[PDB]
Scaffold this active site. Structure first.
Site, PDB file in Angstrom:
ATOM      1  N   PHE A 275      30.780  57.579  26.547  1.00 31.66           N
ATOM      2  CA  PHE A 275      32.166  57.996  26.695  1.00 31.66           C
ATOM      3  C   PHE A 275      33.011  56.829  27.252  1.00 31.66           C
ATOM      4  O   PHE A 275      32.661  56.265  28.300  1.00 31.66           O
ATOM      5  CB  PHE A 275      32.215  59.150  27.721  1.00 31.66           C
ATOM      6  CG  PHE A 275      33.634  59.742  27.967  1.00 31.66           C
ATOM      7  CD1 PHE A 275      34.469  60.068  26.905  1.00 31.66           C
ATOM      8  CD2 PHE A 275      34.055  60.049  29.263  1.00 31.66           C
ATOM      9  CE1 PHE A 275      35.734  60.630  27.113  1.00 31.66           C
ATOM     10  CE2 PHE A 275      35.311  60.604  29.485  1.00 31.66           C
ATOM     11  CZ  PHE A 275      36.155  60.897  28.389  1.00 31.66           C
ATOM     12  N   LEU A 276      34.069  56.431  26.557  1.00 34.17           N
ATOM     13  CA  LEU A 276      34.933  55.315  27.014  1.00 34.17           C
ATOM     14  C   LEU A 276      34.191  54.156  27.670  1.00 34.17           C
ATOM     15  O   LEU A 276      34.514  53.781  28.783  1.00 34.17           O
ATOM     16  CB  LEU A 276      35.983  55.822  27.978  1.00 34.17           C
ATOM     17  CG  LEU A 276      36.987  56.794  27.339  1.00 34.17           C
ATOM     18  CD1 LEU A 276      37.764  57.601  28.418  1.00 34.17           C
ATOM     19  CD2 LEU A 276      37.959  56.022  26.511  1.00 34.17           C
TER      20      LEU A 276
END
Ligand code: HEC
Ligand code: HEC
Ligand code: HEC
Ligand code: HEC
Ligand SMILES: [Ca+2]
Ligand SMILES: [Ca+2]
Ligand code: NA
Ligand code: NA
Ligand code: NA
Lengths: 354, 131, 376, 126, 376, 359
Positions: free
Chosen positions: E69-70
């Site tokens: 995630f990111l």
């Protein structure tokens, strides 16, 4: 009705003939020059007030009466949260039910009974006339009607624009009459984006017509005992203030240690803080909220004492979902918050801001 | 559809990116994956953290503070994605910054981004961004 | 008329003007019902995937469920829960593999079980609904395994534990007919009946060979558990129907979805879920189009609707979009769901007239699988 | 573009296109598009030893070849040059010709996620 | 003219015809060179993401790296390795969070380190290259933490271990100047210099405030670690250049990207990575276009090129596509990389002339970040 | 010359006068009626062959000479894999290097030395004529030349069409003269999609012109010692057949236990199987592969003994990456592979198939 009733309440509010020894009035503890709180130095500082006997100290800090008339009457809402009422523990339903209690409270005004109250009302020809015109002839010779009538006059009096003037700088800004300073506006922004807006706003969303910076809920924010106030109160070192659970009718253990979210109006001038007056500085009251979020050694230290905050008087029912926001207020946001809170000071207490 | 043009708020469709309240929204409008304008979809966890923006409301010409809140703990919805930046400041003014995954305070420590709600919490202005 | 986002903008405007308050919170999905429809998005083999829970009546996404690599979704017919068998890896698509089953509350969508499957036993394949299956009572979830040999995994949903792997012949798919019994389709052209206990060699029985080696039976036959009707098209739109409601396989007469003239003019089924079966109506819906014989996974633009008893054609709908999968609500006046992998849109049609009623777009990357609960 | 229902027309002049003659039964993504090649896996991914076959007509030499496809595994799906052809593709019960299966068996480190597919020839067809 | 796919068809047809045998295997990526470019796809906040490794010269994808995630990618300027700080959850986007650093061999792309970050300390935000950073000697990785307060995490890539968090003031971004020193940008408008010993708090010095409260500095400054040049545009294209080469912050003369006129006709930067800096050429590249003051995250169609020393505009290129992100190779005669989130395509331009040479499409779902090694 | 040389080798091949007691020719062990393998029974059945002394048994099974001529000479390729050579361990470079070895092997034809060999050739007037015509006058008087010339003759004869005729059904099918039965076709599809193709196909990709179903590499598939054969050979209870490592000049411990992948041509008629003749039945050899893949207990039991296969003779350097395919052969795919491998039988040995199960 409204006008005369409140004017009657204005007379009673400042009358010490409603205390046993005739030494105190509502005004003594709820001093109009101090946003209706208690300027008088006691055994425990300004944390608690001293009753009419010159020796009995309360166990709780005297709250402002300002804006108290905006609080709804005590109730359980459909989500099961208790809301409104009067006193820190909500035990009075409303202002009228609250008004009689200090009169007969032996640690406060200490009249023995409604009858002695009525006797005192009878010594004053002006009360004879004022009460009779609003409640009818012979009202004062009936201690029951006399006491209720008094309480009603006090309640009406507290509901006048004079107790809730909405003339703070914050009100002027929300009218577009003035602007917040940078720091104040930062403060307001922080206040409405951080966890504060979760308890110290009337509404969840929408715009409140008469904001009083409280949702009227009950929360245990996990405060320790105020040793000296508790000492002076004489309630004992064994004692536990259970907050809302102490209201009769409330049996639910989850309510233990919960107290009414105070209105933040005039907060800057009604030190010391919290239900027990434990924090003298407003900065402290704000820092206390960092104990739940910050991981820095200093966040566990009350800056007034140099020592650990104290375990909560009630280490159950803490509002952790709200208090454990995952975010810490740095010095800057605390400054900004203080700035913003000071704008909730009514016009007439603007000089007190020192 | 001119992405660079000034944004023209409308008060007639909350699932479109030019809906007035979405004026600093970033991600996905919750109303498209089973939430609503101001509620999270099932299975997600509503964050307590927010970012704010004063959004102009065409209808009453009043400016309103929208405290956006993330619904977290799901993969991104993929529905009605939007990015507006009215009043949006960079990350060092985090209160107005909208690249940040504002999932803090979400139950279960949920920190993944699913969608964003747009509730109103004030009728006020900012110095950097007033109408 | 008024779209859902227009209706919402109006209602919020009215709440604002009225000073109406309301607590921001987590919604419950509305109660599962006959027009709830789940669309699973295998996302063209992505390591993580999505299921969209859709109110087919409103054409509204009412919720979503996350999954891992090529999960197999199931939906209990009675609406009490939903579940999938899913696969994650410790480092996105690399590292330690954990196969597991989640059961989910159908209104909070919260998982109420998370059952590890030992030894990463799921079959990783483009999603076939009937590669993982609920027994009728909802108590056991059966999942197919291909490696090292065909096998079937028994998962106890009620005790929230994996039970065991069953050894089966060279067979495929899993159609449960009972709490302890399922059918599979075998390489030799029979069905295998598998009756299993907690321990013991399963009781495995084969029907006779019911098709020649050169009739090809598609990977997405419709199975109605409540009906015990297995509806199995071949590449040519020849449809095998097998009745398993007695607990043993009775072979129904073959019907042709397409006419000989249509077949002579190149009409053939094609897509993913090429066939739907409406239980109450006893109707077969087949995705068909004119196509070369080896273009059998391409979308189709037409649905033929035929009576299952007679094979009489009742309709040929012109879908108006590239449809890969169909399915139907199992209520009266059913919806015909028509999912375009390409458009990523569930088009929702009146199954009687074939008219498009509404659609739900933005359903992932490569949505393929429609599942409905038979709740009647 | 193509009529998707039209008979597949092989070409032998672009391996990244879905009509490249060796891809007559490919399902997934061409490895050449994510750093592999026609018959090699991209860095970081793991070569399956399983395969499935098809007889693919090579319009260059008029000869039909057996193409035993092989997955490169252990990466999320590349998302580049997606294709799906099914010449002679048989259902899953004839797995030696069936192409929805993630043919990642034998891949090193037990990699079983689908990244892309290679198209090597392994024989002449009859 | 002949495409890479065509040339490949030809070499395969040749190998076939000559009867040339070859072993199917795992390719190595071509050695890192200056024209290698990495495109990170944060996938519009998807729970897993992809990094594309691209040979900028051939416009060819030579490899890929999966992320959570990111994640924050970093690329060692000397080309010896790449790494990222990433985040996974044990159930796709829900459950136990693991933040970790992976270091990868830049030719086999195999991870060579997987270092757990305790207490899920990463800052989860739309990707800002300079929210995670390599110290110059490549031995340390520093990542930003926002919650509960700004902090910076110190990760030893050599001992492959996390050391500790540094307590910093109200500041953002991390620009390493030395094995033990990095600067951050502060809410009060200063830069903080952070020097961390092995233990103790760090020593934190502040520069003077260098911009007023109402000058907004973008989330994507360019920083050349080898030049010590921090290039920081503000919303109006005003560009702060800070020299951190001496160890301490020298402020360069403030420059303007768009003319006072242009700014009057609605020219403003906008995009994601709005700025690039070419070290040898001492040259600033800026995505700008005509746009409302608060459309600062929109794609831009034009790039301006200016001398870092003076502010003189050198070129203005009509990019020919909606560009969100630019960067440049650090070799002589650089490529200018123009990534379109909307097109998911890297357009590879000649940095001198701005003409489009080639492009690499199908770069994920919403690619945003371009990294390059500065190998000269 | 290339006809005459081969024809001189055809004579040597069948000539018992090239063994000490004159009982044994190449053809004795490499019997043309049995695809050039040894039909004779010894102390270990058909596992290993008995020498000219009537007593000595080898430690390895006699492999076919069919298609042996297609194997490249021994070499290391660029990927560091050894390929080609003759003998199960590749210790001969080529047919010509192999050929003189049985002659002098006391366990085989057991001639004492090259001179005893030359002396034999000299005794036969046709050899004097045949050899002298190909190698020159007096060739037989020089034991080195006589021996090498015989090796060359023997190599050449083995390179003729008669040894590698490519006239199997498989060949006929790949010409389009005929088709496989459905079982054979399935067998064939399995063979080329499963792991067999990774070792038993000449090439990694593309098409072989003269497929002999081996890539000529060396793999340790983890076979056990063949106890009776190992007793018979007398090498010791502690002896380890090291495979390729025993080739002189191979020192790499990673080569221990690796044997040349045999050509599968005529596999159907040249049982028993593997380098030590350990498995009697073709099916069994195929079944052995499931031990690396199947999770069924029976996967581990040799069906010919009802006991575990046994510890690998050499437990290290197993070709695990190839062998652990993750997929088990069911009996349908095993039957298919048998039928397919039966198609690899030369035309002249098709009648031998009859007895061995079926065809
Ligand atoms: C000091 C001895 C006091 C005198 C005299 C009066 N009040 Fe008071 N007040 C006092 C305390 C210590 C408290 C809190 C007690 C508790 O148990 O929480 C209060 C509280 C009130 C309130 C409620 C305010 C709120 O909950 O926000 C009201 C409305 C109030 N008091 C009014 C009141 C009146 C009408 C009085 C004259 C009859 C009066 N007070 C006297 C301290 C003292
Ligand atoms: C609910 C969980 C709350 C959150 C989050 C915040 N506050 Fe609060 N506040 C709350 C209660 C229940 C009380 C009284 C607690 C008690 O038992 O006495 C308070 C008190 C304050 C005060 C003191 C006011 C007074 O004594 O008259 C201040 C100054 C205050 N609160 C401010 C404040 C700020 C700035 C917050 C965000 C950082 C905040 N509170 C959070 C309820 C809750
Ligand atoms: C039985 C006692 C034999 C006689 C007589 C001959 N051969 Fe032989 N051969 C025999 C065995 C046991 C083996 C394998 C031994 C080993 O160490 O691997 C062989 C092997 C060959 C080979 C190699 C074939 C291959 O590797 O695939 C060839 C070419 C060969 N033999 C030929 C050959 C010739 C030319 C002979 C007469 C000179 C001859 N053999 C005799 C068993 C016996
Ligand atoms: C390399 C890893 C291989 C794979 C995969 C397969 N085979 Fe194999 N085979 C191999 C070797 C090295 C050998 C000789 C082993 C020894 O030490 O003796 C073999 C042998 C066979 C045989 C016996 C042939 C003979 O003795 O002449 C058969 C019948 C055989 N192999 C078949 C076979 C099948 C059907 C496979 C796929 C299941 C297969 N092999 C894989 C090397 C390797
Ligand atoms: Ca107070
Ligand atoms: Ca043999
Ligand atoms: Na109580
Ligand atoms: Na034996
Ligand atoms: Na050796």
């Amino acid at each position: 009705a409204d006008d005369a009733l409140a004017a009657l309440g204005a007379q009673l509010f400042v009358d010490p003939a409603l205390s046993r020894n005739a030494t105190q009035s509502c005004a003594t503890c709820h001093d109009p020059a101090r946003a209706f709180t208690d300027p008088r130095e006691g055994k425990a500082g300004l944390a608690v007030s001293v009753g009419d006997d010159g020796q009995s100290h309360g166990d709780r800090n005297t709250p402002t009466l300002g804006y108290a008339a905006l609080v709804p009457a005590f109730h359980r809402d459909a989500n099961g949260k208790y809301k409104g009422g009067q006193f820190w523990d909500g035990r009075a339903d409303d202002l009228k039910q609250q008004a009689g209690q200090p009169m007969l409270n032996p640690v406060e005004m200490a009249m023995p009974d409604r009858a002695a109250v009525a006797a005192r009302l009878r010594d004053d020809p002006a009360y004879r006339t004022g009460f009779e015109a609003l409640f009818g002839k012979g009202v004062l010779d009936d201690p029951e009607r006399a006491f209720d009538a008094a309480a009603e006059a006090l309640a009406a009096y507290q509901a006048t624009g004079e107790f809730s003037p909405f003339d703070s700088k914050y009100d002027r800004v929300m009218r577009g009459e003035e602007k917040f300073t940078p720091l104040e506006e930062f403060g307001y922004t922080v206040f409405i984006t951080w966890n504060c807006r979760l308890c110290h706003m009337q509404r969840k969303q929408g715009v409140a017509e008469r904001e009083t910076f409280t949702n009227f809920e009950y929360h245990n924010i996990g405060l320790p005992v105020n040793e000296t106030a508790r000492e002076a109160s004489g309630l004992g070192a064994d004692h536990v203030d259970h907050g809302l659970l102490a209201r009769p009718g409330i049996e639910d253990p989850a309510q233990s240690g919960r107290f009414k979210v105070p209105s933040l109006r005039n907060v800057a001038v009604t030190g010391p803080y919290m239900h027990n007056g434990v924090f003298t500085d407003l900065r402290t009251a704000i820092l206390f909220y960092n104990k739940y979020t910050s991981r820095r050694p200093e966040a566990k230290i009350n800056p007034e004492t140099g020592a650990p905050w104290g375990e909560p008087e009630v280490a159950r029912n803490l509002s952790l979902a709200e208090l454990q926001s995952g975010l810490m207020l740095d010095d800057g946001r605390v400054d900004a918050l203080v700035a913003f809170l000071e704008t909730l000071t009514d016009r007439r207490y603007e000089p007190l801001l020192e | 559809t001119d992405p660079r043009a000034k944004w023209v708020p409308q008060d007639n469709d909350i699932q479109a990116c030019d809906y007035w309240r979405h004026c600093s929204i970033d991600g996905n409008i919750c109303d498209c994956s089973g939430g609503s304008l101001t509620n999270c979809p099932p299975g997600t966890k509503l964050a307590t953290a927010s970012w704010v923006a004063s959004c102009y409301n065409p209808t009453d010409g009043q400016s309103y503070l929208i405290a956006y809140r993330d619904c977290c703990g799901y993969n991104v919805s993929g529905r009605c994605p939007c990015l507006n930046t009215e009043g949006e400041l960079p990350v060092y003014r985090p209160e107005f910054a909208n690249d940040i995954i504002w999932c803090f305070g979400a139950e279960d420590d949920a920190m993944t981004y699913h969608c964003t709600i747009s509730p109103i919490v004030g009728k006020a202005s900012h110095h950097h961004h007033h109408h | 008329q008024e779209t859902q986002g227009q209706a919402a903008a109006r209602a919020a405007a009215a709440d604002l003007a009225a000073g109406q308050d309301d607590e921001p919170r987590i919604l419950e999905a509305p109660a599962p019902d006959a027009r709830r429809v789940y669309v699973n998005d295998p996302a063209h083999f992505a390591a993580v995937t999505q299921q969209f829970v859709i109110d087919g009546e409103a054409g509204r996404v009412i919720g979503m469920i996350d999954g891992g690599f090529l999960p197999n979704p199931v939906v209990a017919d009675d609406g009490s829960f939903i579940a999938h068998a899913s696969t994650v890896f410790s480092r996105i698509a690399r590292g330690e593999r954990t196969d597991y089953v989640e059961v989910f509350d159908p209104v909070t969508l919260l998982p109420t079980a998370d059952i590890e499957l030992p030894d990463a036993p799921r079959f990783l394949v483009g999603t076939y609904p009937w590669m993982t299956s609920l027994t009728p009572d909802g108590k056991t979830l059966l999942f197919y395994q291909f490696s090292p040999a065909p096998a079937v995994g028994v998962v106890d949903l009620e005790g929230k534990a994996f039970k065991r792997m069953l050894d089966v012949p060279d067979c495929y798919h899993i159609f449960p007919t009972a709490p302890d019994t399922f059918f599979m389709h075998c390489r030799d052209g029979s069905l295998a009946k598998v009756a299993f206990g907690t321990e013991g060699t399963p009781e495995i029985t084969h029907t006779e060979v019911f098709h020649p080696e050169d009739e090809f039976l598609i990977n997405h036959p419709a199975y109605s558990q409540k009906a015990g009707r297995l509806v199995w098209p071949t590449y040519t739109g020849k449809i095998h129907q097998i009745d398993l409601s007695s607990g043993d396989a009775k072979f129904l007469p073959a019907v042709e979805a397409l006419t000989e003239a249509e077949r002579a003019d190149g009409w053939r089924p094609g897509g993913w879920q090429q066939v739907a079966y409406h239980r109450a109506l006893d109707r077969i819906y087949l995705l068909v189009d004119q196509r070369d014989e080896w273009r059998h996974k391409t979308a189709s633009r037409f649905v033929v609707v035929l009576d299952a008893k007679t094979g009489e054609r009742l309709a040929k709908f012109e879908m108006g979009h590239e449809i890969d999968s169909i399915n139907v609500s199992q209520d009266e006046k059913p919806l015909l769901y028509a999912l375009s992998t390409g458009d990523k849109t569930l088009y929702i049609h009146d199954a009687e007239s074939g008219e498009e009623l509404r659609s739900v777009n933005q359903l992932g990357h490569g949505p393929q699988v429609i599942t409905t609960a038979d709740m009647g």
